[PDB]
# Entry
Amino acid sequence: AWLLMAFTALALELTALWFQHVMLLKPCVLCIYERVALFGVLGAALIGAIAPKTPLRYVAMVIWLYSAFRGVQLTYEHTMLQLYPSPFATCDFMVRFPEWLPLDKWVPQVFVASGDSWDFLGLEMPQWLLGIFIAYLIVAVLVVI
Amino acid sequence: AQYEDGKQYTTLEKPVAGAPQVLEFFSFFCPHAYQFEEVLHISDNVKKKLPEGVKMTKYHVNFMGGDLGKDLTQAWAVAMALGVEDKVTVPLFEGVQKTQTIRSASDIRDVFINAGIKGEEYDAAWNSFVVKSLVAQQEKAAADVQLRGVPAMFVNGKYQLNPQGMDTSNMDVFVQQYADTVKYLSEK
Ligand SMILES: COC1=C(OC)C(=O)C(CC=C(C)C)=C(C)C1=O
Ligand SMILES: [Zn+2]
# Structure
């Protein structure tokens, strides 16, 4: 799928990353998790498992079976709460990376949160990303799995 | 046989001395904090089950609401210092969060006045060393239990509250399941 993703890389990837730092906007916390359950596919099937060799791409099948997946509920759970809030939840300003692998401090500039309380088309931000996190799911599941 | 780390609570890696007995954080800005305290009054329920008349503290947080939260905190720093609290909780939630009728220092000021707080006796404490100290030590207090999100909670400066390792579908239930986990971690 390197063709899709090379032009999801050189066409879709940073229409994200930029076109926020473009108007210099503040993220959230889920934000960069969704940026991670993203830039951890458009990098994790490029230099990933459709790979620098394209005979065997069922490693990328699981790289999509359970990565586009996170991207789904990250956005979903996120978007759930927008006028429909929930007791046992939180709302943060700080972020994490277990495995002593450390997102934040590697790229201070883009792996960073700033937790706060607009508009994107006939929508706003997060839903508009389920419009692709769940899009690049089924119409990507279909042809491979 | 049945009480699990990472489950109903999580113990702190770097724990903190002189810390309060139970130390719920919260903003007047988390629709969840609202849900937590204003809808479920978990605070009160925890109080209830609580062991032998025990320090049920509650601090406010700065991040959300930027420049306003800052004063909303300071306001509250007072509200503890007096303190009305109880009297200023409900309306300030109801203000800022639910109706969007609070604009800054004085809107808050008003909601104190209006709630039985003496006009500028509120301002009489607001600049008292009493409440500088209070504020600063609810920054410190958060930075200590290394904080990120709110609502939060910490038994005796040791145990981060995990509301997860508990029923999530049943309200009446999760509450008592929450309030319980406290009675436990306290006398422990
Ligand atoms: C609602 O807040 C969010 C942003 O606002 C600055 C983002 O930039 C981003 C990153 C933007 C894209 C298009 C992936 C996300 C995921 C987000 O949730
Ligand atoms: Zn009620």
Notes: Chain A touches chain B through 17 residues (CB under 8 Å).
